[PDB]
Structure formats: structure tokens, C-alpha cells
């Protein structure tokens, strides 16, 4: 800002009896090198407070909307060991499920190492825990693969 | 929208006219001369292009006025040097420069245009009854 | 068929160079040296060498004639100016300009080249209108 930068606080010219203007400190916004009158400061919260009930209602609405569409399916714990850390099996499964041009988002209540290790080298899909999924992530996928066991906690969560 | 109103395209066919000043009053003679020169009564007159006639006037010194203007109406001409005010009377102009009187009178009523100094040169006067435009073969008419 | 010659960074005022160029422009080459190297002007001496070099380039590097050629355009353009300072009375400060110039000359072999440039301009606008037509023909 104006006074933060280093610079002479002296008057470059006598105020009167001079051809030039009344300009004072040489670090004013008129001169070059700095002296911005208005500029962003490192203390701005940028927080957008929203009531909890509205957030819960929005989450329930997006769950209901995306659950009743013909792009989400159920996945159980059985094939989380058939699929290994290696992504070859994951790529074959993706090709079988014709999701090569989709952005399906995973949701599970176990967080197995085999699934997390895979799909980390691909940006189309990602795995997440129930406690960390958000509305934007829930709806940007346009398709979901949901674990059956998670449904109990889902209906408990309202 | 519009009919694209007809305007002249510099068609300058101009007749020659002679008027007998057998004792005409200066004002009416001047306005009639201005009317004849400007072609104001021409059927398709356009004030955007030059379209007029040539007027020859005879017996400049025979032109007479009315009332006591012979000793009341005065003409002043100015020269750019200070003190140069030529003051003349009606009779003096009638006897000394009567061609100048009618010339200036007909010049004054012309609109102050660039064509004003070009429209004026179409008039010509003579103190006597002898003219030099005979080669143009002019036709005369009275009271114009 | 132009075979012009250029010259850069000449220490001479543009106005005098333009004056002498206008004096010499529009003539042949034989009279050029006589009408140019016999005038008390500093810029004339440099233009003499410039015209000699132009004649040499025309006769050698492009295969032109030695008599049908004539000077076509002599101009003077403000070159890269350099600024210094000079003191004045009562400690005054002024910025003095040290002017420079750019001088080029042009030769021709025949009275045209006043229309060939116009021919190229016509070709350019013809290309523009042809492109416009071709774009319009994609409906």
C-alpha cells in the first residue's frame, strides 16, 4: 500500500512559486513503482456461513436425485479383493462398465487399501469416505457406485 | 419515402435583357433588377446553382426619386484610413456617379454569398443611350 | 526491377536531406552526380556515395541497363534520436536533442513503377474480395 513501501517522505518541490503541480510524496499512486490505493489484504475470511439444516436438506435432495437415475449401481466387499492394488483389473472393470468417458465417484464404509491404491493414477475416478463426501463431489460424478453396507448409515444420516 | 426532388445540373442558358429607365423610381427599378438577375420567378429556380440573366440598363442619369431625398438622402463611403468618409448627396450622385448608385443599389439586395460577387457582374449601365453589348444581340422589355 | 539501396545512422538533419532529395528526385543518373555534388550542402556528399552505390547495385547485382534507369524516390526519415543535456543560465536544465536520419534511394528502369505498386494494391484488394466471395459461398 501507500505507506508500507519505503520512500522519501520529503516534498519534491516547494509548494508555491513552482511550475509543477502540488504533488506530495513521491510514492503516491500517481508515480510508478507502487503506491496502490486499494488492494487485497491477507486477512479476508471468505467464509460463506450456511445453516446446518439447509445443508442436510441439500445433501438429502442430491442423494435422492442421483440415486433414482440409471447410472448408479451397487458394489459389495466381495470384489474389493478380486480387484488388487494393481489397476489392470480396475481398467478392465472400467471398460466392462463402459465408464471410460465418465467421472464416477466411489463411496464406501471400509476404505480398503486395494481400492485406494488403484484409481489414484487416474483422474477420472476417486474413492472417498462417507464422512468426507460433499454435495459438489456427489453431483459432479453424474454416476455413482455405492457400497450396500453404506445404505444403513445413509438412511440413519437422514 | 421521397421522390428525389429535381435540382438543376448547371444548365446555364441565359437570355439578354434591356430595360428603359425613362424616369423610373430607384427602389422599384432596383427590386425589379434584382428579381430579373436572380431569376427568382423562373419556373424551376434553384438557389444552390448559378441560374440568372444578363440585364442592360440605359439612362442611368435619368432615374429620378420621390420626396425631399434630393437634399436629405446621403450616401457615405468609407476608406480603411481614418477620416476617409466620402459623403455625397442624391443630386451629386445623379450627376457625378449615377451608374455607381444603381450598381450599388442592385448589389445590396443580393444575398451575402460567394455568388453575390459573381451574380452582380451580370448587370451593366450607361449614362447615355449607347451600349457595347450589341454583338450579343439582346432583346429588350420594359418595366422589368 | 527496383534494386534500391539503403543507409542508416547518418549525422544530418532530416529537413536538409529531404530538401536535397526533392531537388534531385525525378531525374536520370548522369546529371545526378553533377547536380548533386555541386551544391554547398553537407547531406549532398553522402547522397553522392549512396547514389553511386545504388548505380553499382543496379548494374551488377540485378542485371539492369546503364542508360534507361533513373532516380525514382529520394526521402529522409528521422532515425534513432539521441538525447543529451546542456546547461543554461541560473543553473537551468534543458534536454538537447541530437537528431539523426535515415536515407534511402530508389532507381527504376522505365517510366512505370508508379502504376506497378497500384497494380499490387489492386491485386491485394482483389484477393480480399475473392476471399469474401469464397466465404459467402459457404451457405
Amino acid at each position: 500500500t501507500k505507506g508500507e513501501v519505503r520512500g522519501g517522505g520529503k516534498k519534491p518541490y516547494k509548494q508555491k512559486h513552482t511550475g509543477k503541480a502540488r504533488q506530495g510524496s513521491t510514492r503516491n499512486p500517481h508515480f510508478v513503482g507502487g503506491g496502490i490505493v486499494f488492494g487485497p489484504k491477507p486477512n479476508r475470511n471468505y467464509s460463506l456461513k450456511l445453516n446446518k439444516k439447509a445443508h442436510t436438506a441439500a445433501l438429502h435432495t442430491v442423494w435422492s436425485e442421483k440415486l433414482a437415475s440409471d447410472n448408479t449401481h451397487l458394489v459389495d466387499q466381495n470384489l474389493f479383493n478380486k480387484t488388487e492394488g494393481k489397476t489392470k483389473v480396475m481398467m478392465q472393470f472400467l471398460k466392462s462398465a463402459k465408464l471410460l468417458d465418465k467421472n464416477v465417484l466411489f463411496v464406501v464404509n471400509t476404505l480398503n487399501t486395494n481400492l485406494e491404491q488403484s484409481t489414484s493414477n487416474i483422474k477420472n475416478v476417486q474413492v472417498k469416505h462417507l464422512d468426507k463426501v460433499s454435495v459438489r463431489d456427489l453431483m459432479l460424478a453424474n454416476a455413482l457406485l455405492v457400497e450396500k453396507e453404506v445404505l444403513k448409515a445413509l438412511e440413519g444420516k437422514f | 419515402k421521397t421522390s428525389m426532388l429535381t435540382k438543376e445540373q448547371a444548365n446555364k442558358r441565359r437570355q439578354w435583357y434591356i430595360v428603359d429607365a425613362a424616369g423610373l423610381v430607384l427602389g422599384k427599378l432596383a427590386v425589379k433588377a434584382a428579381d430579373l438577375i436572380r431569376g427568382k420567378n423562373k419556373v424551376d429556380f434553384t438557389p444552390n446553382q448559378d441560374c440568372g440573366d444578363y440585364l442592360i440598363i440605359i439612362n442611368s442619369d435619368q432615374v429620378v426619386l420621390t420626396g425631399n431625398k434630393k437634399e436629405n438622402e446621403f450616401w457615405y463611403h468609407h476608406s480603411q484610413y481614418i477620416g476617409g468618409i466620402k459623403k455625397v448627396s442624391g443630386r451629386d450622385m445623379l450627376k457625378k456617379q449615377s451608374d455607381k448608385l444603381v450598381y450599388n443599389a442592385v448589389k445590396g439586395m443580393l444575398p451575402d454569398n460567394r455568388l453575390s460577387r459573381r451574380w452582380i457582374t451580370k448587370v451593366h449601365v450607361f449614362k447615355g443611350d449607347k451600349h457595347n453589348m450589341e454583338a450579343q444581340k439582346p432583346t429588350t422589355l420594359n418595366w422589368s | 526491377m527496383i534494386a534500391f539501396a539503403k543507409q542508416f545512422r547518418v549525422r544530418i538533419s532530416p529537413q536538409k536531406a529531404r530538401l536535397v532529395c526533392q531537388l534531385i528526385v525525378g531525374k536520370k543518373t548522369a546529371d545526378a552526380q553533377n547536380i548533386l555534388s555541386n551544391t554547398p550542402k553537407k547531406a549532398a556528399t553522402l547522397i553522392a556515395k549512396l547514389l553511386n552505390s545504388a548505380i553499382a547495385n543496379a548494374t551488377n547485382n540485378h542485371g539492369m541497363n546503364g542508360d534507361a534507369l533513373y532516380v525514382f524516390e529520394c526521402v529522409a526519415n528521422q532515425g534513432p534520436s539521441m538525447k543529451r543535456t546542456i546547461p543554461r543560465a541560473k543553473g537551468s536544465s534543458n534536454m538537447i536533442t541530437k537528431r539523426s536520419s535515415n536515407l534511402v534511394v530508389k532507381l527504376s528502369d522505365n517510366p512505370n513503377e508508379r502504376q506497378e505498386l497500384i497494380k499490387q494494391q489492386k491485386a491485394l484488394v482483389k484477393k480480399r474480395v475473392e476471399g469474401q466471395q469464397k466465404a459467402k459461398m459457404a451457405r
Binding site: - | - | 529537413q15 530538401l19 531537388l23 546529371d31 553533377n34 547536380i35 555541386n38
Partner: protein
């Protein structure tokens, strides 16, 4: 004094209209083929059929 309104390029052009230098008259020497000045000697010397300078 100084000007009170700036001079236009038209004004300076009309002022310098008289700047064009005259075409100096020349003459051909009678023995040294060259275009010299008028009433003046050429680089050889024979102002007429008579010399004055050595070589230059």
C-alpha cells in the same frame, strides 16, 4: 514574445514552401570532360584554354 496557440503542420508547411533550393547552373569544360561550375575552374585547371593550378 511567444505563440499563444500552437502552430499547425499546415502553417509550418506553408512557411517552408520557400525552402526549395535552386538548381545551380553548370558548364562543360572545353578540354576536361566534366560538369564544372559556371565562370569557375574545374578539377583540372583550364578555366579556358589557359591553366592556373598544378593538378587539383
Amino acid at each position: 514574445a511567444v505563440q499563444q496557440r500552437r502552430s499547425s503542420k499546415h502553417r509550418r508547411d506553408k512557411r517552408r514552401s520557400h525552402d526549395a533550393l535552386t538548381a545551380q547552373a553548370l558548364s562543360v569544360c572545353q578540354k576536361c570532360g566534366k560538369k564544372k561550375l559556371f565562370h569557375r575552374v574545374c578539377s583540372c585547371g583550364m578555366y579556358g584554354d589557359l591553366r592556373v593550378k598544378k593538378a587539383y
